[PDB]
């Protein structure tokens, strides 16, 4: 469910439009955390900060 996957990343992102590498590191095992960091592009939309990752772009590429 593509509406539940981005929504789940957003939950782990504490409702932010992007997720940080250390948040993936904290909330997921070291495997799928460094998996995601090296397949998540870069969030440049509203509210972006250094390190912000685009979990929505990582997602909709799949579902």
């Amino acid at each position: 469910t593509a509406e539940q996957v981005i929504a789940s990343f957003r939950i782990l992102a504490s409702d932010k439009p992007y997720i940080l590498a250390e948040e993936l590191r904290r909330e997921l095992p070291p495997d799928q955390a460094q998996y995601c960091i090296k397949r998540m592009p870069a969030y440049s939309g509203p509210g972006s900060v250094p390190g912000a990752l685009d979990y929505a772009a990582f997602s909709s590429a799949l579902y």
Partner: protein, 303 residues
Amino acid sequence: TCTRFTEEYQLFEELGKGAFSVVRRCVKVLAGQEYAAKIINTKKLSARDHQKLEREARICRLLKHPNIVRLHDSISEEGHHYLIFDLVTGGELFEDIVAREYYSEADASHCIQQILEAVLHCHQMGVVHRDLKPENLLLASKLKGAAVKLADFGLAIEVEGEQQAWFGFAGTPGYLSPEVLRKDPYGKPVDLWACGVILYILLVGYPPFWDEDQHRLYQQIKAGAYDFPSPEWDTVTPEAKDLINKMLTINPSKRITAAEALKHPWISHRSTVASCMHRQETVDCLKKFNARRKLKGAILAAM
């Protein structure tokens, strides 16, 4: 040439996935009544998986209880087996707790009493579930106060009285009992360990045992190394903690049984013993708990 399901039932949307089965809504066309069809493609199953499929079918037929999914029908066709269940429409209990926002010990106690009644019924019928976990705790409907329904007997086994045996390595790591992890002979008490894990999660929203290194996770379970850290556990009644301790008891012979747990005052005297305070942090953690499970499930599918 036996095609009774194809003849008399119409399939609709998927309701849940499984490793080697799918669950789709269906309608008994003549009656117009909705059911859930758990469908297994049997065309190239191994003999062992045939046995396990047949086992699940027997156990499901055998279990009739208000808090267990109810088998309506069972149909064998050439390359498909159909288990037809009464449809439950309330979704996962953990998702409903989050959606309804407010949750107290009194709510958790009412939830776990229902789970314990399901489990007690399984054990009275000589059945050990072995897969008690959040994905298998459904709600009968979207009605407020709808009943909990225990689902998924795919891992369930038949036992004879109180005899213990090595029935194999099966279950989700975070819910596994010390005796299974030690490869000891086991039986019904493995279900009550898993109930203690679930109940711990119902109270604070995160699991009692958690480590990305699964070898260390299993060490921690086998040591019964869980804690009630401050601040969240400071507001949990002693009686709720006491019930968890008795479920999360390493020695299975001393672990509390389902019948004893149903007489535990936090359960049997919930109205005067269980706290009615809303636990906002519990719901917040549960929201992350559910997201971590769905993502960890969606991710390995993609890998």
